[PDB]
Nucleic acid binder design. Structure first.
Ligand SMILES: Nc1ncnc2c1ncn2[C@@H]1O[C@H](CSCC[C@H](N)C(=O)O)[C@@H](O)[C@H]1O
Ligand SMILES: Nc1ncnc2c1ncn2[C@@H]1O[C@H](CSCC[C@H](N)C(=O)O)[C@@H](O)[C@H]1O
Lengths: 375, 122, 227, 375, 227, 122
RNA sequence: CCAUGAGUGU
RNA sequence: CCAUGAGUGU
RNA sequence: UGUGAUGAAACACUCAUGGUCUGAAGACUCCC
RNA sequence: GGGAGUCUUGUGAUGAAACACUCAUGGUCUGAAGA
């Protein structure tokens, strides 16, 4: 029975006592060791290990890692694994030393110099494949979208309060922020509004007239061109941001269908991404029970209920789903529970590779919703 | 199936279904994929049972990963209808968990040790 | 200003221009600071000011930690190295002789740990999940101290698992108990009792239990010896 | 002795008993009444009242309003005023009726139709001069400036988190948000970075090299042109806001010097405006004690102190004054107290008219600060 | 649905599709709402839902206001008319016969009062300071009800001053007592007592004192008669 | 001066300074423009006293406006040095307030009624 | 920050 | 929402 | 309908009004 | 330690909790009935 060790130092064989029966030293090469460590994660044995298991011809071998076992069985040996074995410890107890003994480095001084730069290079490598995940861009974009949303609203509220010094009646006449902004942007003074320039936005015959009459009889302030352009800077920023938003929605749709098609099928690009952003990743979203996915967002609401034993939230960021916020209060809980349930399934098929099944999921959901509403 | 990590002989699969039934009676079990998930996340479960005929495979695919992080052992059975109907339900179940074995302690400890042997170990 | 040694190796206190007393360590990389900390020269030697509000180890010291098992040439496995605030200080304490293996699984944060560990030959960064010591088995050795500050409900179990992998027999474990990330509902004080029992029910011999208040809310640190 | 009444209805003379001795009815004209009511506020008598005080030749007259007295004395009469006099009440008690009696309207039906439209027009007029105050624009502008400040920071924070997927090393290398944004805006990919193009914005020799080396050895992610331009939309928005900000500052400076020069002499346009914003107007700031001015902003901190008897804030929005936030903590309360005192005087000379005296105010303030600093 | 009269003139209650009861008034301008309120047709007559959470008068009714001095053809001086929420409901109650004089000194808000008052011949808007009744002396007449809801520390004194100008002897005053804008420090209940005393030490005969809770925190309304 | 609303004859001006001194002794006064302001804003002040030789006039200009809103009577004296030195100070004061008259009630009531007469009234 | 009245965004 | 570690703006 | 029934507090903003510190000391120098 | 003066100070001495954001990690409902 041979206990086998894998390390940066190479591959060592030990008996049950803790004596080095035989060893094969690794090459002192950053490139190759890094790759074999990355490879060892998937179960793939070191090439120093392959050579060692040939030199010694052991009937029963035992390794450190459970992922290696089936690989070494495919190579011809009878194999098991012991986790925190006495031998693996015995090896590491003498690890400052046995680097010199098996001639991996001449002295301790540059065993560590090497090991340091391996660790530097080995994490540098992991840092890259973490950044290279496609879901991270979905997350950032939706976050920036929620920033823009927030800003559009802040500026539009500011603009209306501001521009209302000059033309106060326009505020209650234009519900839509984008329209409001377009007016302050395109015209300036209230006395510069004109019919055809307004017909061009989409304003119906009748409204144009109400706006113009409002401007004529306006009890607003007469103001300089310096003052107006100051306001107009905000208006143009608002308009810019609306274009950037729509651009970001399309970009987001592209990534979201690529990275999580099943989830996207259920709740759209934005809300799917939003759920990714609260969970942290797609793989984290997948690992969640529905009862979590149902309340993501709403954490203040959740932990209030958990601390005091009061009433929990019915829905977190899921509230944004058309079926929920439009539905009466007593139906919301059930629609949320059903959505979250399907979302969890959607996340898992998305995460663990499975090809698009969002159509039957939607159909299953809309069935459940139609039943809820017939009461 | 591809979410099935190792091979369970039918003698074991039956001893699993038995262990669960005694656990309904004398201990505490959790039934259903979402409740099984929470039991792992919370570290309450001693044994996790997963069915081999779940019909989108990926529904339970996260359990092997989750169970290994929290180091809770898991086992497979062939029929979901059989596991649910073990569970004291008249409908199927894709996965279940034993939180407290009760009068199945000896029965469970043999299972969590047989799945160790047919996994590697010693 | 005056700087002088304390009961613990390579850890010093300052008398200040005003009359305050702050902890500091001997700067292994002079002219260079890891977070925003003050650099102080005294008798031509440079010290890094060790803020207790940021570093739970300094906190523990100021709350009267009996004996500190981190010293000159100590080998430490450091679970939850994060941005490198505390681990930089144990780098200073340990000096070029000893070694510190910094396990951390959040890339957004190991980003900044890199910068600390580049400048510091003591520190061996690892982007790995401390729940699977198998995934860093191949880089580390056995160690004298297992310093564990990880935000995880099963943080104590994780620590024990690493211990039986990498902690020398008769080695020491400094385990940070984060009540509010084990359970926000339970009383921090119930949690401290139950997590220490896990260590005792393994075979760790509780030496000292400190409550990190002022400096850290709902936290405690345990010093115990592995057998 | 004649008790005189002024109303929309006209000018009526009563004896001490409450009997109409003589009256002169107003013209039923919205234009003229409104103006005479606006004028009455400043103490100017109705023109109907002037005619009435001639027809009757009274020795001792008594009016309703104290502002009228000196105006009627200049016109030849001995005059006083009684506030809530029995006579004034007697008149209003019969006011539905005595409109018809003095023939202001034929019936009650269109006394109220007229009075309704007078009220409508009389408030329409007041609403206008309110809107016409110049300090309101100073307030709006700084409020938008503060929104822009807030947004720049939100977007820059986002951009760095986002763009660092591709080029993480650039974040700790560029402190300045505007600079960081300029780089992502002009380049996107890190392999588009050149000594030439970077010199063409004034980055210094040594820094250009550190950037390019960091881009060369970057452990970032390789990423599509679609991904980068998404990010670059934010970068350009950030750049847009910086320009808009600088424009708003100059505008703000223009208005602030005009509307409150002495205040602006003390704390600058922005902070000056900011105080106006919190106070609501210049005249409101002028009515304040220093001890209020000193704490504006910081309301949460103040009322916490007032409810519990704890320690109060040393400074509210005033913290922004360079002499305060740069100074050590034991000097700040004194500096704040001295500033606030001067600001109260500054606001008052600004409010109750004209003169610039901001130079001595600054001189007195800097004397007080120099003393504080010598301990 | 069912609408029926209550103890008070032109004030109605609704039975609803589900079994809820809400106050409403008879719509003086049918098809048109001032805030977001529900419009309701019953037997070809339209009513405006009177939300108690917005209107203090609706609140006071739902807290059992004995007798409401605002009815058909009443003349009211309304101090602090604001955006027109409550005053629009007193316009409905008072009908074309009666008159409401809305005093309000915040231009930002009189802006929206204008719109309410255009549609309604009942209401006579006034942008003036209730502290100077001289500045509207010349537009108003004497009145039956002095309804006073103004956020001012000396609100009570303001109310009394307007009263001796405009309130008819034996007329009624509904005075809203805003504890938190008289003094956030003092106890709301100490304030209600001391303000009522100001009315009594003038000569107002306290009829009823209601606490507006659920509907308005730290508020009380006083009904009293001027002598 | 322009912030001075009406004319105060020296007999009255002296009766005011007297009223203030007795109020230091037997009642409660506030001294200084900021403290006087707060006394009006809070409605505590019964009588407000403003000096005529304030040197930037605008320093106390807000008081007439503020006192009228709160309906607190105000009066003038000719010297700020004289008002402060009345107040129990050795330096000047621009404005002061009487919160409780104490042993000057009769003396104050005569002042608040003389300034009514030379203002209009009856 | 507390209170009142009026609104906005996902 | 609570806690920990890292940072930003006026 | 355990591939989730039943119950059950989603999140982010803006404007207007009022409540908005303390109150006489501190620093120097000269004679025995 | 006793005595004496000078400068600044109610046009404010002395004392005394300014505000707004971002990232990372963990703590993240119920569980068999319904028409
Ligand atoms: N399972 C796990 N493995 C490794 N690191 C983990 C972990 N769970 C949480 N962490 C990390 O633990 C850290 C807690 S912060 C620790 C602070 C640091 N030791 C200091 O004092 O300076 C976080 O950075 C978090 O990402
Ligand atoms: N001195 C004063 N004169 C007139 N109105 C005042 C005032 N002080 C405060 N107010 C007004 O009082 C109002 C308080 S809100 C009043 C609510 C309204 N009556 C309703 O129920 O619908 C504010 O609009 C404020 O501007």
């Amino acid at each position: 029975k041979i206990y086998l060790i894998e390390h940066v130092i190479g591959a060592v064989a030990y008996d049950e006592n803790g004596n080095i029966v035989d060893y094969i030293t690794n090459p002192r090469d950053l490139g190759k060791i890094t790759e074999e460590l990355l490879n060892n994660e998937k179960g793939i044995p070191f090439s120093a290990t392959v050579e060692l298991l040939k030199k010694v011809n052991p009937q029963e071998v035992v390794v450190e890692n459970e992922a290696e076992v089936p690989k070494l069985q495919a190579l011809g040996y009878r194999v098991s694994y012991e986790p925190y074995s006495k031998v693996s410890r015995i090896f590491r107890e003498s690890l400052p030393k046995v680097a010199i003994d098996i001639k991996f480095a001449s002295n301790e001084e540059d065993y560590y110099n090497f090991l340091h730069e391996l660790s530097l290079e080995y994490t540098r490598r992991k840092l890259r494949s973490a950044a290279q995940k496609r879901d991270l861009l979905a997350i950032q974009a939706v976050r920036a979208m929620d920033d823009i949303d927030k800003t559009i609203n802040l500026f539009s509220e500011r603009l209306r309060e501001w521009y209302s010094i000059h033309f106060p009646e326009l505020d209650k006449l234009i519900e839509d922020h984008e329209e409001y902004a377009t007016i302050v942007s395109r015209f300036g003074d209230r006395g510069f509004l004109t019919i055809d320039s307004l017909k061009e936005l989409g304003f119906n015959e009748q409204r144009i007239n109400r706006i113009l009459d409002a401007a004529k009889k306006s009890i607003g302030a007469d103001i300089s061109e310096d003052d107006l352009s100051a306001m107009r800077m905000i208006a143009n920023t608002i308009l810019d941001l609306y274009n950037i938003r729509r651009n970001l929605n399309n970009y987001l749709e592209g990534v979201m269908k690529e990275v999580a098609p099943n989830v996207t099928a259920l709740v759209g690009p934005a809300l799917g991404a939003r759920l990714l952003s609260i969970a942290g990743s797609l793989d984290e979203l997948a690992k969640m029970p529905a009862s979590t996915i149902q309340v993501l967002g709403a954490e203040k609401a959740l932990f209030r209920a958990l601390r005091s034993g009061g009433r929990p939230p019915k829905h977190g960021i899921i509230f944004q789903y058309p079926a929920i916020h439009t539905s009466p209060r007593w139906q919301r809980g059930k629609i949320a529970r059903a959505l979250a349930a399907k979302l969890a399934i959607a996340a898992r098929v998305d995460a663990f590779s499975g090809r698009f099944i969002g159509d039957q999921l939607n159909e299953q959901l809309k069935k459940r919703i139609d039943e809820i509403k017939e009461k | 199936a591809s979410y099935v990590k190792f091979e369970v002989p039918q003698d074991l699969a039956d001893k699993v279904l038995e262990a669960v039934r005694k656990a309904k009676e004398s201990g505490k079990i959790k039934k259903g994929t979402n409740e099984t998930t929470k039991a792992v996340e919370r570290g309450q479960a001693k044994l996790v049972i997963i069915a081999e005929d779940v019909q989108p495979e990926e529904i339970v695919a996260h359990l092997p990963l989750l169970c290994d992080e929290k180091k809770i052992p898991y086992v497979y059975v062939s029929s979901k209808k059989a596991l649910g109907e073990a569970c004291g339900l008249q409908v199927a179940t894709a996965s279940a968990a034993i939180l407290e074995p009760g009068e199945a302690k000896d029965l469970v400890d043999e299972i969590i040790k047989r799945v160790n042997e047919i996994k590697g170990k010693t | 200003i005056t700087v002088k040694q304390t009961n613990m190796e390579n850890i010093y206190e300052c008398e200040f221009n005003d009359g305050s007393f702050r902890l500091c360590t001997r700067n292994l990389v002079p002219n260079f600071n890891v977070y925003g900390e003050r650099l102080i020269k005294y008798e031509g030697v440079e010290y890094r000011e060790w803020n207790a509000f940021r570093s739970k180890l300094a906190g523990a010291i100021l709350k009267g930690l009996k004996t500190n098992p981190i010293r000159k040439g100590t080998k430490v496995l450091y679970l939850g190295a994060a941005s490198g605030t505390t681990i930089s200080h144990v780098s200073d304490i340990i000096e070029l002789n000893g070694k510190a293996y910094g396990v951390e699984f959040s890339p957004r944060v190991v980003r900044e740990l890199l910068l600390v560990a580049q400048r510091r030959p003591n520190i061996f960064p690892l982007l790995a999940d401390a729940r699977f010591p198998q995934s860093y088995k191949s880089v580390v050795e056995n160690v004298d101290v297992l310093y564990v500050d990880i935000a995880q409900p099963d943080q104590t179990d994780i620590a024990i698992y690493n211990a039986k992998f990498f902690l020398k027999v008769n080695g020491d474990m400094l385990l940070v108990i984060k009540a509010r990330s084990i359970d926000v509902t339970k009383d921090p004080k119930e949690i401290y009792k139950t997590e220490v029992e896990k260590l005792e029910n393994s075979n760790f011999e509780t030496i000292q239990i400190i409550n990190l208040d002022p400096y850290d809310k709902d936290h405690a640190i345990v010093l115990s010896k592995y057998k």
